[PDB]
Design a protein that fits this description.
Chain A: Keywords: Acetylation, Chaperone, Cytoplasm, Endoplasmic reticulum, Phosphoprotein. The structure is cut from a larger assembly and holds 9 protein chains of 9 kinds. By secondary structure, chain D is an alpha+beta fold. Helices cover 27% and strands 28% of the residues of chain D. Chain E is of the alpha+beta class. Chain E is built from 5 helices and 7 strands; from the N terminus they run αββααβββααββ. In chain E, a hairpin with a 6-residue loop joins strand 6 and strand 7. Classes of the chains: A alpha/beta (268), B alpha+beta (229), C alpha+beta (234), D alpha+beta (212), E alpha+beta (241), F mainly alpha (118), G alpha+beta (244), H alpha+beta (236), I alpha+beta (241). Strand 1 of chain A pairs parallel with strand 1 of chain G.
Chain lengths: 268, 229, 234, 212, 241, 118, 244, 236, 241
């Protein structure tokens, strides 16, 4: 704001037009920053580089979980119905992070490739991520399911946000989705951005089925109530035969939450 | 231009945008003329109170200081009364010590410094005003002009104010030194006539002389006599 | 996210300090190394400017009869810091009849530097010091300040632009043998400074300090003689 | 005008083996008249520390009201209770805070140490503590002390053994000494209050003394 | 989205008209742990909850101390909590030193609100982020006063400001009839049962996550912790369902 | 009455006689503008309301912080017509005029003391 | 102040225009008409009658506490026009200044000094980058023992002047033109003539009929220097005597 | 309907739609750019071990000292920025010595952690600060209650701990500590466990020139291990 | 005129001050309050929107007292209301401290109005958002009522209404004969008004707070006894068909 008395302060922009408009000595700094911030795939087989993930092999289901809550849900519920092997991960240097982006491969029928990536992708690396994960023109038979959690102070309504009920589930489905929805769709005034939006946009523009699931929780730290709230998801053809043991999975989820991850010491 | 809008920042060529803007503002004001002669000086100006609804008394332009210093503004009306009061206070402050009246030059330097002091600071606008002051010390007449930033000059026939370039061009071919006040007053009246947008009337001229008696201000009927003559 | 000192970045990286360090890494170089009983504080002059007089423009300032000083960076801020350090040294000597140790005065200078980094209305002092001198116990000492707040008891480090090369040269040659006698240290520091400079002797200044003999600059004739002696390499 | 006036009083303190005793007469007298006859001069501070404050009765109240507040501040801050070894230094600092406008008091501190042990401190109007064993003092001092010097710590006696003070002996001695010293002094008498304190709490005691 | 220019500071009014910083602070205070504030005719129990940074570390302090007849809880930012309890303690001590009576709650809470009202107006300052549940009995029965991030304090009978607590409010409202004539043990049982609703399913109250604190008629404000809280936490039935 | 809880910079001033006023016209001359302003503020606050002293004093504060740096003479052209001493020349400007100060301090020290950092 | 000065050629007081005009004070001049009023003050030869306008928004509001004609000294008035929240403060400031002058010099103030003091303390608000130029029209009234009755007007910028007749409000232009036309015809005046002239000017500018209780009148005369407000009876009598 | 770039991290006092004061969070995030440290609380005293990461061989090893005395029975391990930690240490020393002079007794570790945290709380609007202290401390010592080890983060708290790292790769130094802690093991094994844990983060090897073991015992005062003494334990 | 509505010291090309108008609008979204003066007294009434039953009577009230014979019925932001009440208390206290007797209503109202105006003149503090009523009584002067708008207005009203439900309240109050009535029927009229203008789709709980000062109480401000309040409540409830 006002650094000192009487200083003229420019009005902060909203659209983003504050950006301004080269000599060789400056010509390289940009490329150094770009190479540091560039995204590369480092599938941990032997310092590999890899061409795209879907080029070497096809698949039918590519469920992706983004966010710590979604990763916990997938690692707790659907892991004991078979054995999974790792195919690769990615490395990122966003200033907000670095915590992994490892994919999973089932030793059974390989149509399922559930992913876990809690890393926060920047606002520009997402397009490169899509380019290096899918490619340019994939098949027209895949089904994509995305599970994410957002803060409750995003839903807009006439009533008070605090007065709103417990965390709930909302869905956004593309045109090419014959299956019905298990929860009411998101209202018009609310929109979603970043990686789930990029995935949904790519799926919509390339004419392949997709489905989006959101959770408007009031707490961002991982817990049991919010992850348990994802129960009604396990009733659709997107993920039906991958669940085989509910109570032991609940017990192992309780044990994982018992680890008492480092919370925030700013509050009490 | 981002480098504008603030008087504490230099544009990347060497200048101060606010100072030049204030100079243009004081240029866009009311014409004034000052003539220095071997016997004395004359200061002539006109007022915007053309309508008869106004009054001749009360508000007035050429306010005397002490007995030998008289000024005239060519800028913003409500923005020089404080400066005039400060000038009178400084004159009295000098008079209590050094029991002899202020010479003109010290007063010019002090008022220039106090005016400049609102340039180098940050967060306050410069004064929009530029004033001539006339003195009479050591048997000599003195004339000076002050700028919004503050830089006194030993001017002789300045016609600063609105359309001052035409006044300067007209005066650069009439003054020839070795003159009395009688011809100087007529020359000043002609300079005002050159750019007035109308005819001079009995209540549009506020000439004031500073001969070796003091700072007598000409009475309206005396101004009528000179205007007729 | 770099427009005020008080603000941070999304990762940390207080940026005004880093920019001040970049500004410091632009002036003339400076070195220094201690021996058995000797200290050298050689620097180099960027431009000759024969019309200008070398008497007024100089870097090796005196802080006390046992503490000397050499900076690198903007001149005026360094002069202010040196003035304050002189005043503090005299005040400490008055308040306690004991010649001031190197560590105390260098800590005071570091604190004075660090104080101008706590409000977005005062820019930090961008300079770097090479405080070196003899304590009251006879142990040779050397230090190095830093614009932010830090200081280390270095041995033979260097500052200024192109300091990596001279630091590598010093670390690849510093041994106990080279610090035994007196003139060996001068030979070593001259060989170190000869790298970055184009031609030696023209724009190189030294300041030899001995045990309680006070600071003593070197005339150009002695510098030329030392360069000639060091030119006998085979 | 004179911002000082006398009010009398007397403080006696015996620090035995595992018991501290503080006792004091009770009479507010100034000039030549008597203001009251109850006027207790033995205030409690903690469960194991008692303060006796003689002297002018305009600061004897202010120090009492300040010490408890500072004790509460310390307890809230450090989450503990001040022992009798720190109150001495704290009160000395407070007293010396006004060395150019001295407090007109003569304070006596008695209490238990970290272990079961007697301990009685002693101050001066300017403020300087010093550990003691049987120190008394106040307005009518210089009479109480010599008898205790004769009795408690055997001095100028030969061919006599040493015996520790028993609790039954302490009250019997204190009552006798106050009765003996009440007659020959003017400011003492009226009612006597005893504040014997042990490792189970504080118990009071009141007896008659030269009824006036 | 027409709010970016009207929320960067606190001294600006939106076109609808509402200070957005106050609403943001009231939303922020919801980060912490639940704290029930029951009261009775003779005693005013104040049961709280404690989080855990890790299994190795120790828990935070949620039941501070003010004086012999008043004890506050805390919820939200732990930074301003101490900065405000200092003012609490100083005012209580001054009231005890100048006069000779305990400072009544009804004036203390008003003073706290008056102090917290200042920062919400002047520039360059931010509202506090505490959720105090000041409790204590002085002269006319125990009181339970709540404090909000905005300087708008409420009187109350029983509430659980803090973390996820709407279910706690519902439970506390359902059984808000017996709290007028019960002994200490029954009131504490009700408080713990009300707090148990906040805790997620398949989770019980251990000995290391409760901070029962009781102030009443003839006993000064005392905080209970560690194994000392076991006698109160004995019956508690067996499970919510 | 404070303990220590650089002597060359500030020294040679015994504690004895600052708590001992000089010739009785000392507290009425060292602090005169402050006392006059306090009296006027009290009068206005008593007779006109609580708004006037607050407004006027905060105006004083607003106008005070635009002068030159302390190590140079301050013109003080403003704040004077607002104070009311616009033409009240007296024994404050003709005797020991601060422009011709006989002794002068260091710039950095004076400005850092004016900021109150020390 | 930790909010800064808004960037722009007309968004703050201390920034000059490229041609050199203070746009903020011009907005202040435009701000008087926002409230919506009209005030006319005419001086004759021995009287200083002031007329104004009164508007009642509704019926519940009392008709005795909505006046726009305050009193400054024992024999000086004012017809404050514009935003009420700022005139209500300038009136108190002027009262305090008058009391201070009477205490410091021991006689009633000539109108010029009060006008100059108000103008200066209003101008000082147009330099610091923390102030707002409060929008009013400080019109004075009163008689003097050396020059007779006088009428002075002040503006938020700080430029005062001496007028023989003044109109202030939302209809300044046509009222000033009408007064200019009328003054040039006859020179002598009297109390009744001045009151009738003011009422006629107000009626011909507003072009509406005046109810007996719609306009208040405050006057000062040579025989009665004390500032007095005409009651309802006198105003009604003059209104019914007009045009008859 | 539209996406707009709104920033709330600029400004030390700005509340984000959901709380979580961003400036303090960034200050906490800034800690990881520093040096690792460790501290174990044991029934027979506490132990500390802080790395050094010497930039160049010419730098004198004892010039930089993360371990620093506070008193005869209290030691702490700074991390992150250096000058701010120096200021905090100076204030803590002044405070504890002043308290000793006033009340004439020894310090209690909580009674000094409270003081230093109260000093660090003054971030905000007078030599007052303007930014949060981007530092972290591991106070350690022994008192009447026994041996204690307090952790103080930049924002406002002094939560008690038994073994909690502070430097970079804190997750690796935390999971292993959770897996290895026993709450009853002897002091001798503490040194070995701490060294084994520290060996897992360094890119370099374990040599006696970049580790600063310094423990305090219930009987003895502060004892800083020397190179010769540490060589015996660094062999295994 | 968006763009110039960011600081008090900033005009608009039209001439209005936008922050002041925003503060004006920001008082609307609240409850409602009315106040009427009879021949020999005044009376007020506020629709207190009662929240969940966890609270009780004597909660956050809007019928403060300022002196032994004056009182307000503020309706707006509560923190600023409390600050203004404290300021008015201090003003009346100072006046009685040295000028004898008690402050006349007009002087106190003018002082408070000028103080609340003093903030909208500077770029350092936000303007107060709250309406403000200061009805009172005298022995010889009579019964007087005043209302103070947030910015500067200090007009004197026979009887008005402030808050959200204001236009309907004004229209209904217009049809009364409140110039020859007493203090035994204006209370019933106020109750019937507050129940004829009260929304129910967004408001659920009500609790009327009433107070009068007049010849019936010989110049003293206090809440009506519960019997009269209950009788007026019953009459108003039965009046709605």
């Amino acid at each position: 704001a006002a650094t000192f008395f009487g200083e003229v302060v420019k009005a902060p922009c909203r659209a983003g037009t504050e950006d301004e408009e080269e000599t060789p000595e400056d010509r390289e700094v940009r490329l150094q920053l770009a190479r540091k911030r560039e995204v590369r795939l480092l599938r941990r087989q032997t310092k590999t580089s890899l061409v795209s993930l879907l080029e070497k092999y096809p698949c039918s289901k590519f469920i992706i979980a983004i966010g710590n809550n979604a990763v916990a849900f997938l690692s707790s519920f659907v892991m004991n119905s078979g054995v999974w092997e790792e195919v690769g991960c990615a490395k990122l240097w966003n200033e907000w992070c670095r915590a992994f982006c490892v994919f999973y491969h089932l030793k059974s029928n390989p149509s399922v490739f559930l992913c876990q990536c809690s890393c926060y992708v920047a606002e520009d690396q997402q397009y490169q991520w899509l380019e290096k994960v899918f490619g340019s023109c994939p098949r027209k038979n895949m089904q994509i399911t995305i599970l994410t959690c957002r803060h409750v102070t995003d839903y807009k309504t006439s009533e008070s946000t605090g007065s709103l009920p417990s965390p709930f589930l909302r869905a956004l489905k593309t045109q090419n989705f014959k299956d019905s929805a298990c929860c009411p769709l998101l209202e018009q005034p609310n929109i979603v951005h970043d990686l789930p939006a990029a995935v949904l946009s790519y799926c919509q523009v390339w004419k392949i089925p997709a489905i989006l699931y959101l959770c408007y929780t009031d707490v961002m730290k991982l817990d049991l109530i919010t992850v348990e709230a994802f129960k009604p998801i396990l009733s659709t053809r997107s993920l039906k035969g991958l669940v085989k043991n509910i109570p032991q999975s609940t017990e192992i989820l309780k044990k994982l939450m018992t680890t008492n991850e480092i919370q925030s010491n700013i509050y009490t | 231009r981002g480098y504008s809008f603030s008087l504490t920042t230099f544009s990347p060529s060497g200048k101060l945008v606010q100072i030049e803007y204030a100079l243009a503002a004081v240029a866009g004001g009311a014409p004034s003329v000052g003539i220095k002669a071997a016997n004395g000086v004359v200061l002539a100006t006109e007022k915007k109170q053309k309508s008869i609804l106004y009054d001749e008394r009360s508000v007035h332009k050429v306010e005397p200081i002490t007995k030998h210093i008289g000024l005239v503004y060519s800028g913003m009306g409500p923005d020089y009364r404080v400066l005039v009061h400060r000038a009178r206070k400084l004159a009295q402050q000098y008079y209590l010590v050094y029991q002899e009246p202020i010479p003109t030059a010290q007063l010019v330097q002090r008022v220039a410094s106090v005016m400049q002091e609102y340039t180098q600071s940050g967060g306050v606008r410069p004064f929009g005003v530029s004033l001539l002051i006339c003195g009479w010390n050591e048997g000599r007449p003195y004339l000076f002009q002050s700028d919004p930033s503050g830089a006194y000059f030993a001017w002789k026939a300045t016609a600063m104010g609105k359309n001052y370039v035409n006044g300067k061009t007209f005066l650069e071919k009439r003054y020839n030194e070795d003159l009395e006040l009688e011809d100087a007053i007529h020359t000043a009246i002609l300079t005002l006539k050159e750019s007035f947008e109308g005819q001079m009337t009995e209540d549009n001229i506020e000439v004031g002389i500073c001969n070796e008696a003091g700072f007598r201000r000409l009475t309206p009927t005396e101004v009528k006599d000179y205007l007729a003559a | 996210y770099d427009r005020a000192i008080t603000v941070f970045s999304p990762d940390g990286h207080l940026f005004q300090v880093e920019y001040a360090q970049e500004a410091v890494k632009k002036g003339s170089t400076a070195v220094g190394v201690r021996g058995r009983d000797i200290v050298v504080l050689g620097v180099e002059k960027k431009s000759v400017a024969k019309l200008q007089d070398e008497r007024t423009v100089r870097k090796i300032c005196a802080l006390d009869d046992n503490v000397c000083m050499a900076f690198a960076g903007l001149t005026a801020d360094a002069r202010i810091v040196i003035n304050r350090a002189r005043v503090e040294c005299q005040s400490h000597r008055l308040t306690v009849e004991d010649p001031v140790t190197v560590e105390y005065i260098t800590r005071y200078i570091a604190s004075l530097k660090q104080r101008y980094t706590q409000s977005n209305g005062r820019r930090p002092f961008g300079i770097s010091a090479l405080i070196v001198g003899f304590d009251f116990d006879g142990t040779p000492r050397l230090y190095q300040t830093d614009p932010s707040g830090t200081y280390h008891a270095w041995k033979a480090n260097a500052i200024g632009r192109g300091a990596k090369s001279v630091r590598e040269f010093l670390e690849k040659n510093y041994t106990d043998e080279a610090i035994e006698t007196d003139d060996l240290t001068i030979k070593l520091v001259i060989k170190a400074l000869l790298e970055v400079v184009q031609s030696g002797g023209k724009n190189i200044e030294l300041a030899v300090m001995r045990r309680d003999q006070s600071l003593k600059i070197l005339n150009p004739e002695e510098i030329e003689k030392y360069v000639a002696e060091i030119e006998k390499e085979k | 005008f004179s911002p000082y006036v006398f009010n009398g009083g007397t403080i006696l303190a015996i620090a035995g083996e595992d018991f501290a005793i503080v006792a004091s007469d009770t009479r507010l007298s100034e000039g030549f008249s008597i203001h009251t006859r109850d006027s207790p001069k033995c205030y409690k501070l903690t469960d194991k520390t008692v303060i006796g404050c003689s002297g002018f009765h305009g600061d004897c109240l202010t120090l009492t009201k300040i010490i408890e507040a500072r004790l509460k501040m310390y307890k809230h801050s450090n989450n503990k209770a001040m022992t009798t070894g720190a109150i001495a230094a704290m009160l000395s600092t407070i007293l010396y805070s006004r060395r150019f406008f001295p407090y007109y008091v003569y304070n006596i501190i008695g209490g238990l140490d970290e272990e079961g042990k007697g301990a009685v401190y002693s101050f001066d109007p300017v403020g300087s503590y010093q550990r003691d064993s049987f120190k008394a003092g106040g307005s009518a001092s210089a009479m109480l002390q010599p008898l205790l010097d004769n009795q408690v710590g055997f001095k100028n006696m030969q061919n006599v053994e040493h015996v520790p003070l028993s609790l039954d002996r302490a009250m019997r001695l204190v009552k006798d000494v106050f009765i003996s010293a009440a007659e020959r002094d003017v400011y003492t008498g009226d009612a006597l209050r005893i504040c014997i304190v042990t490792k189970e709490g504080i118990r009071e005691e009141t007896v008659s003394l030269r009824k006036d | 989205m027409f709010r970016n220019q009207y929320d960067n500071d606190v001294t600006v009014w939106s076109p609808q008209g509402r200070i957005h910083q106050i609403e943001y602070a009231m939303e922020a205070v919801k980060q912490g742990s639940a704290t029930v504030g029951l009261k009775s005719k003779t005693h005013a129990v104040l049961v709280a909850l404690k989080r855990a940074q890790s299994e190795l570390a120790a828990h935070q302090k949620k039941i501070l101390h003010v004086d012999n007849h008043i004890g506050i809880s805390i919820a939200g930012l732990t930074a301003d909590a101490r900065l405000l309890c200092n003012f609490m303690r100083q005012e209580c001590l001054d009231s005890r030193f100048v006069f000779d009576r305990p400072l009544p709650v009804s004036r203390l809470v008003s003073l706290i609100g008056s102090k917290t009202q200042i920062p919400t107006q002047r520039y360059g300052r931010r509202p506090y982020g505490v959720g105090l549940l000041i409790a204590g009995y002085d002269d006319m029965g125990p009181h339970i006063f709540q404090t909000c991030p905005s300087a708008n304090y409420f009187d109350c009978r029983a509430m659980s400001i803090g973390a996820r607590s709407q279910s706690a409010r519902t439970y506390l409202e359902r059984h808000m009839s017996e709290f007028m004539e019960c002994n200490l043990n029954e009131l504490v049982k009700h408080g713990l049962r009300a707090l148990r609703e906040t805790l997620p399913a398949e989770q019980d109250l251990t000995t290391k996550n409760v901070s029962i604190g009781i102030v009443g008629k003839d006993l000064e404000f005392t905080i209970y912790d560690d194994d000392d809280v076991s006698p109160f936490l004995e019956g508690l039935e067996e499970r919510p369902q | 009455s404070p303990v220590t809880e650089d002597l060359l910079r500030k020294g040679f001033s015994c504690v004895k006689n600052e708590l001992l006023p000089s010739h009785p016209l000392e507290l009425s001359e060292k602090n005169f503008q402050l006392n006059q302003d306090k009296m006027n503020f009290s009068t206005l606050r008593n007779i006109q309301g609580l708004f006037a002293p607050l407004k006027l004093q905060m105006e004083f504060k607003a106008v005070q912080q635009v002068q030159r740096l302390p190590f140079l003479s301050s013109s003080n052209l403003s704040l004077d017509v607002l104070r009311g001493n616009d033409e009240t020349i007296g024994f404050e400007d003709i005797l020991n005029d601060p422009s011709q100060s006989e002794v002068m301090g260091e710039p950095h020290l004076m400005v850092e003391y004016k900021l109150g950092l020390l | 102040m930790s909010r800064g000065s808004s960037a722009g050629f007309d968004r703050h007081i201390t920034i000059f225009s490229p041609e050199g005009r203070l746009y903020q004070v011009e907005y202040a001049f435009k701000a008087i008409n926002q409230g919506g009023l009209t005030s006319v003050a005419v001086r004759g030869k021995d009287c200083a009658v002031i007329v104004t306008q009164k508007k009642v928004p509704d019926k519940l509001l009392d008709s005795s506490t909505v006046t726009h004609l305050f009193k400054i000294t024992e024999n000086i008035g004012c017809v404050m026009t514009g935003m009420t929240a700022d005139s209500r403060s300038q009136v108190q400031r002027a009262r305090y200044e008058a009391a201070n002058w009477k205490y410091k010099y021991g006689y009633e103030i000539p109108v010029d000094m009060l006008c100059k003091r108000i103008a200066d303390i209003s101008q000082v608000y147009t330099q610091n980058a923390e102030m707002r130029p409060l929008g009013c029209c400080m019109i004075l009234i009163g008689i003097d023992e050396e020059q007779g009755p006088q009428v002075y007007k002040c503006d938020p910028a700080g430029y005062y002047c001496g007028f023989k007749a003044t109109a202030a409000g939302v209809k300044q232009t046509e009222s000033t033109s009408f007064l200019e036309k009328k003054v040039k015809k006859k020179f002598d005046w009297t109390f009744e003539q001045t009151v009738e002239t003011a009422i006629t000017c107000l009626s011909t500018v507003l072009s509406i009929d005046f109810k007996p209780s719609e306009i208040e009148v405050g006057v000062v005369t040579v025989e009665n220097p004390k500032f007095r407000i005409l009651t309802e009876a006198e105003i009604d009598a003059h209104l019914v005597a007009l045009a008859e | 309907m539209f996406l707009t770039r709104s920033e709330y991290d600029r400004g030390v006092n700005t509340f984000s739609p959901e709380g979580r004061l961003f400036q303090v969070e960034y200050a906490i995030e800034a800690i990881k750019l520093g040096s690792t440290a460790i501290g174990i609380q044991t029934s027979e005293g506490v132990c500390l071990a802080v790395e050094k990461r010497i930039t160049s061989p010419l730098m004198e090893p004892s010039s930089i000292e993360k371990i620093v005395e506070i008193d005869a029975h209290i030691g702490c391990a700074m991390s992150g920025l250096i000058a701010d930690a120096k200021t905090l240490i100076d204030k803590a020393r002044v405070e504890t010595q002043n308290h000793w002079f006033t009340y004439n007794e020894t310090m209690t570790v909580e009674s000094v952690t409270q003081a230093v945290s109260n000093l660090a709380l003054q971030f905000g609007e007078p030599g007052a600060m303007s930014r949060p202290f981007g530092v972290a401390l591991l106070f350690g010592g022994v008192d009447e209650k026994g041996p204690q080890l307090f952790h103080m983060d930049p924002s406002g708290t002094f939560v008690q701990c038994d073994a909690r790292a502070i430097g970079s790769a804190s997750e690796g130094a935390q999971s292993s500590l959770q897996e290895v802690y026993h709450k009853s093991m002897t002091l001798k094994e503490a040194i070995k466990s701490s060294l084994i844990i520290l060996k897992q983060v360094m890119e370099e090897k374990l040599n006696a020139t970049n580790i600063e073991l310094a423990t305090v015992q219930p009987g003895q005062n502060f004892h800083m291990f020397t190179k010769e003494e540490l060589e015996e334990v660094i062999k295994d | 005129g968006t763009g110039y509505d960011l600081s008090a010291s900033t005009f608009s090309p039209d001439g209005r001050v936008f922050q002041v108008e925003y503060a004006m609008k920001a008082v609307e979204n609240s409850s409602t309050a009315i106040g009427i003066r009879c021949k020999d007294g005044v009376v007020f009434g506020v629709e207190k929107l009662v929240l969940s039953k966890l609270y009780e009577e004597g909660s956050n009230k809007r019928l403060f007292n300022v002196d032994r014979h004056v009182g307000m019925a503020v309706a707006g932001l509560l923190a600023d209301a409390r600050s203004l009440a404290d300021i008015a208390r201090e003003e009346a206290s100072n006046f009685r401290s040295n000028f004898g007797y008690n402050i006349p209503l007009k002087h106190l109202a003018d002082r408070v109005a000028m103080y609340v105006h003093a903030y909208t003149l500077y770029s350092a503090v936000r303007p107060f958002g709250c309406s403000f009523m200061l009805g009172s009584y005298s022995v010889n002067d009579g019964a007087q009522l005043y209302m103070i708008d947030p910015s500067g207005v200090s007009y004197g009203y026979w009887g008005c209404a402030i808050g959200k439900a204001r236009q309907a309240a004004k229209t209904e109050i217009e049809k009364l004969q409140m110039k020859e009535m007493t203090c035994r029927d204006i209370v019933k009229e106020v109750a019937k008004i507050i129940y004829i203008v009260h929304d129910e789709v967004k408001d659920k709980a009500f609790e009327l707070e009433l107070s009068w000062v007049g010849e019936l109480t010989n110049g003293r401000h206090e809440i009506v006894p519960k019997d009269i309040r209950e009788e007026a409540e019953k009459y108003a409830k039965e009046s709605l068909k």
